[PDB]
């Protein structure tokens, strides 16, 4: 009751920090994603844009192997044509906005690799379940 | 023959029945929750209220350990300050509206307990997965 617990900022709090300081709390930006006669359609087209951009990322998240785990390993290797950076730097030197600039060409190649690497593991799980 | 209309009830069919017969069929209340120029905007503002109140309970469900499993055990204990009743009744004496009157003060403390009991299990599961 003395109130001694630790608090870790709030929305977009670690948005400039390094990866080693950004991955402790990702959930705070996660939970503020659904709740929070002509000016009702500015309410309507803000609501069906909010629920639309929530469902598109929850669907691209949903169709990989990661239902709601929010951080998950996968099986695809890291081709050095994507980033060519050292591993020991890019988790404590840089920050996320330089990464999103540093990789934005190579997205939609990674998402197709992730979907095929999930569906191949999916049918191989089915082929495992089929033999027994 | 096989197949009769006696025990195959409908929407809100067991709404007066006991907990042991209402938890038998929860899907019937589940499926009638989403489907079923100025009187079209009363359709629009009814639709985006239906899909909004579906996503809010599916989000409060989502952030616990129960993604879409619809019946799930958890790890938090049952503090007897809430109900203090014996178990052998609460599957055959009351009905659901009698439970909901009997507990309605104690919601939103329990809902705060489940999120912390999930997210503690989430990062402790992650710390278990990181070392191996």
């Amino acid at each position, epitope marked *: 009751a*003395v*109130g*001694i*617990g*630790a608090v*870790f900022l709030g929305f977009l709090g670690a948005a400039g920090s390094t990866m080693g300081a950004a991955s402790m709390t990702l959930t705070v930006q996660a939970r503020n994603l659904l709740s929070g006669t002509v000016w009702g359609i500015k309410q309507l087209q803000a609501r069906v844009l909010a629920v639309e951009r929530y469902l598109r990322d929850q669907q691209l998240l949903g169709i990989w192997g990661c239902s709601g785990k929010l951080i998950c390993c996968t099986n695809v290797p890291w081709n050095s044509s994507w980033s060519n950076r050292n591993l020991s730097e890019i988790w404590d030197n840089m920050t996320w906005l330089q990464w999103d600039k540093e990789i934005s060409n190579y997205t939609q190649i990674i998402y197709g690799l992730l979907e095929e690497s999930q569906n191949q593991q999916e049918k191989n799980e089915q082929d495992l379940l089929a033999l027994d | 023959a096989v197949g009769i209309g006696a025990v195959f009830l409908g929407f809100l069919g067991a709404a007066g029945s006991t907990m042991g017969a209402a938890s038998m069929t929860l899907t019937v209340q589940a499926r009638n929750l989403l489907s079923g120029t100025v009187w079209g905007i009363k359709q629009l503002q009814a639709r985006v209220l239906a899909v909004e109140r579906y996503l809010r309970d599916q989000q409060l469900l989502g952030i616990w350990g129960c993604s879409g499993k619809l019946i799930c055990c958890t790890n938090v*204990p049952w503090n007897s300050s809430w109900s203090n009743r014996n178990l052998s009744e609460i599957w055959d004496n009351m009905t659901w509206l009698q439970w909901d009157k009997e507990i309605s003060n104690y919601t939103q403390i329990i809902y705060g307990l489940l999120e912390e009991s999930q997210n503690q299990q989430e990062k*402790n599961e992650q710390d278990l997965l990181a070392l191996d």
Partner: antibody
Amino acid sequence: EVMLVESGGGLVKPGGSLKLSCEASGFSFGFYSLSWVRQTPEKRLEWVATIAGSGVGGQTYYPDSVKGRFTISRDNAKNTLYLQMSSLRSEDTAVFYCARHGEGKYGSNFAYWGQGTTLTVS
Amino acid sequence: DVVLTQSPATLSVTPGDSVSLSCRASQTISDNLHWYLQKSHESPRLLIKYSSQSISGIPSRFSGSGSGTDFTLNINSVETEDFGMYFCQQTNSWPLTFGAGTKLEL
């Protein structure tokens, strides 16, 4: 992982001064409230000092028996906790533990304990 | 100050039996109660936080209960590794105080 390693313990004459250190790793140091708690040779546990974390308000707390004598401090840039002791008494003799608290409302508990450093005042 | 009274002070039990340890507060600490085990030559380790919620890594045989001033730690099949000194702790008010501990012997 979370590491807390205390140093600086020793044999001190009464009336003397001694600075303890606690080196922490594995967490965002400044955000957590940290404490020193001591365990007496008869094994009793006595809270000694607390300094709140950066998002906790950063204040210090002491029991009356040590106020004006004991000082808890932190150097967040180096992830180190300090305990400054002055006007030491023979009753201060104990193993001193560095401890890290939990998170949020249910985080006033001690979450991590150090190995301890021994202070003997005689 | 809140006085925490742990009972019994010392207790010898055979491995496999179950025990109930009492902690009584001089004022209400309704959910402010944590349990720690300190085995010989070791630092204390948190077992149970805020009366009853279990902690990852603590065995399921450890259970807590109680509300207000009266709290109980159940150990429902005691193992050899469980023997040691047991402390309760309150965070309801300054200064922080401990119970005297139950020492569990084999």
